[PDB]
Amino acid sequence: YAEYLMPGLQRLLDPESAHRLAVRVTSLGLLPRATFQDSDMLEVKVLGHKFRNPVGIAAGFDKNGEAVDGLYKLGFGFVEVGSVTPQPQEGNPRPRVFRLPEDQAVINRYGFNSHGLSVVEHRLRARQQKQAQLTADGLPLGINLGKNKTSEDAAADYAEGVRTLGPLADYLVVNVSSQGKTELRHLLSKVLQERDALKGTRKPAVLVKIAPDLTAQDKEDIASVARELGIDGLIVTNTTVSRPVGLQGALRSETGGLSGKPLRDLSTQTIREMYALTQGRIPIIGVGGVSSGQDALEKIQAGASLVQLYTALIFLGPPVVVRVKRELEALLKERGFTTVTDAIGADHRR
Numbered sequence: 001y002a003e004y005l006m007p008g009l010q011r012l013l014d015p016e017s018a019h020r021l022a023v024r025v026t027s028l029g030l031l032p033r034a035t036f037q038d039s040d041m042l043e044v045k046v047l048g049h050k051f052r053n054p055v056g057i058a059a060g061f062d063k064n065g066e067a068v069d070g071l072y073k074l075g076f077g078f079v080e081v082g083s084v085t086p087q088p089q090e091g092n093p094r095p096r097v098f099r100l101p102e103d104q105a106v107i108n109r110y111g112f113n114s115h116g117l118s119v120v121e122h123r124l125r126a127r128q129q130k131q132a133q134l135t136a137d138g139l140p141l142g143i144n145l146g147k148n149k150t151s152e153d154a155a156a157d158y159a160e161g162v163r164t165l166g167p168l169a170d171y172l173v174v175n176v177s178s179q180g181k182t183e184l185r186h187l188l189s190k191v192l193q194e195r196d197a198l199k200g201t202r203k204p205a206v207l208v209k210i211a212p213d214l215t216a217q218d219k220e221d222i223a224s225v226a227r228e229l230g231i232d233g234l235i236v237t238n239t240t241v242s243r244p245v246g247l248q249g250a251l252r253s254e255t256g257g258l259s260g261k262p263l264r265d266l267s268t269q270t271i272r273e274m275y276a277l278t279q280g281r282i283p284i285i286g287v288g289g290v291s292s293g294q295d296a297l298e299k300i301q302a303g304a305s306l307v308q309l310y311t312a313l314i315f316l317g318p319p320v321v322v323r324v325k326r327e328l329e330a331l332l333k334e335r336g337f338t339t340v341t342d343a344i345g346a347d348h349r350r
């Protein structure tokens with residue numbers, strides 16, 4: 001009864017309520033488990049790990065690590081636990097989430113509503129053994145670290161997030177996308193330093209997530225600092241504060257970050273630029289408006305080693321995960337790529 005009923009409920013609910021119900025339904029494992037088997041050609045070895053498939057769920061869906069197993073069960077090659085702030089906080093006042101149906105877009109200004117490190121840490125440790133096996137089987141767990149609203153030292157918040165959740169993550173993410181090149185360098189250096197100070201052999205990779213709203217200078221500074229400090233990767237494109245001419249959703253004037261289709265090509269272009277600026281030496285996780293295997297391939301070809309999607313799940317439902325992987329698989333063969341890895345950065349080989 002999962003499908004059939006869920007599509008209806010979605011239409012009868014405001015976007016935030018629909019979001020919370022989706023997380024619940026997913027954690028309870030009420031959705032059918034994907035039968036699609038990830039072929040060897042979809043495997044990507046990057047960030048010190050193995051990814052059975054290159055399609056993950058972007059940060060922000062499961063902010064509190066409540067539906068991880070259910071997400072892998074849907075077919076995602078990896079999961080990124082939504083932004084986690086040190087202390088719990090409620091985020092911005094409602095309404096803070098809006099659907100733009102006609103544009104297959106969403107606008108949100110959640111404001112980092114989070115359960116906090118203690119809670120998320122408890123949840124993830126309760127399933128650490130299970131995750132250790134999932135990871136070993138090529139299903140990595142990423143954890144996106146955020147900072148509290150009234151926090152003074154952003155770096156201190158991120159570091160606390162590194163010490164607290166780092167032991168449970170395969171990779172960690174720090175947003176600069178939810179000051180000059182100098183403050184960016186110092187903030188990241190402290191994050192990496194905290195990462196290197198973690199106990200154990202398997203040190204999680206550290207990625208920087210950027211918005212698509214960057215000046216020519218911002219892009220060069222990020223590439224330079226990333227290259228200089230030895231950052232492990234870049235997640236390219238959080239939501240955008242721009243509102244493209246031609247948006248038809250009546251709620252387009254609302255403040256917040258725009259995601260979904262309108263962000264698709266802007267995001268890909270940003271991946272192309274960052275890849276070039278870093279000379280293809282820094283793994284990029286492409287994200288933004290991915291709704292088909294075609295969209296994923298465009299991002300991979302522009303420079304992404306892996307991709308993520310979120311908004312498409314909202315307008316196409318859970319079937320979108322397997323659909324993107326299946327199409328991506330057929331498009332790779334059709335275009336002469338024997339494996340996903342061979343397509344990474346393909347547009348840059350000319």
Ligand SMILES: Cc1cc2nc3c(=O)[nH]c(=O)nc-3n(C[C@H](O)[C@H](O)[C@H](O)COP(=O)(O)O)c2cc1C
Binds near residue numbers: 058063288
């Ligand atoms: C409702 C909502 C909440 C989000 N929350 C987060 C978050 O907590 N942390 C983060 O790094 N990105 C967050 N994002 C951004 C997504 O991870 C992704 O970068 C962006 O939505 C573009 O992908 P998409 O077009 O496939 O949704 C959020 C996006 C949406 C739509």
Ligand SMILES: O=C1C(=C2CCC(c3ccc(Cl)cc3)CC2)C(O)=C(O)c2ccccc21
Binds near residue numbers: 015022314
């Ligand atoms: O997950 C959703 C959502 C959704 C409702 C339930 C859907 C669904 C549809 C069919 C099945 Cl079989 C399972 C889940 C998944 C998408 C929805 O409508 C939103 O508006 C939203 C806004 C922000 C963040 C997340 C979301």
Ligand SMILES: CCCCCCCCO[C@@H]1O[C@H](CO)[C@@H](O)[C@H](O)[C@H]1O
Binds near residue numbers: 016
């Ligand atoms: C037949 C199945 C009916 C399912 C009804 C789900 C109603 C969910 O309702 C939502 O719950 C959220 C918290 O859980 C609240 O924050 C939202 O304001 C509320 O609309």
Ligand SMILES: O=C(O)c1cc(=O)[nH]c(=O)[nH]1
Binds near residue numbers: 060083108112
């Ligand atoms: O919590 C949020 O508002 C948020 C964080 C982020 O990184 N991206 C986004 O679109 N929303």
